[PDB]
Amino acid sequence: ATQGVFTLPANTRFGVTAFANSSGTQTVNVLVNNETAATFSGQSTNNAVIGTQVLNSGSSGKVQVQVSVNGRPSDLVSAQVILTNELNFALVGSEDGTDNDYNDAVVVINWPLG
């Protein structure tokens, strides 16, 4: 199934933050309505934050996370969780290799802000 694609409410600010846990430099691209809105890159095996940013979901609300390592797309896992009918999380893990820890880039999107 498709992973890493989330429909947000339109015209709403949201946060996106990426963490790395791999020997490989992770590149995380965040598309809003199919156009690049942020791109983060970095290397850590210690959960370093490789980027954090506030972005607007725009007219479509469509947000897609892509993760690439060594020029190759990583395998993605994702889900969304909503607490008290108000606080939203879109969660992505990714695997760049064969150990299947799925933490090589971890991406957390949260809304609403403010």
Ligand X SMILES: *C(=O)C[C@@H]1O[C@@H](C)[C@@H](O)[C@@H](O)[C@@H]1O
CB 65 within 8 A of CB 32: no
Q: How buried is 57 (Cβ within 10 angstroms: 0-12 exposed, 13-18 middle, 19+ buried)?
A: buried
Which of 26, 66, 78, 96 forms a contact with ligand X (CB under 6 A)?
96
Question: Considering the complex, what minimum distance in angstroms separates the CB of residue 96 from ligand X?
Answer: 5
Q: Is the CA virtual torsion 30, 93, 70, 52 positive or negative? A: positive
Among the candidate windows 17-25, 35-43, 52-60, 77-85, which touches ligand X by CB under 6 A?
17-25
Q: Does 23 bind ligand X (CB under 6 A)?
A: yes
**Window 43-62: residues binding ligand X (CB under 6 A):** 45
Count residues contacting ligand X (CB under 6 A)? 10
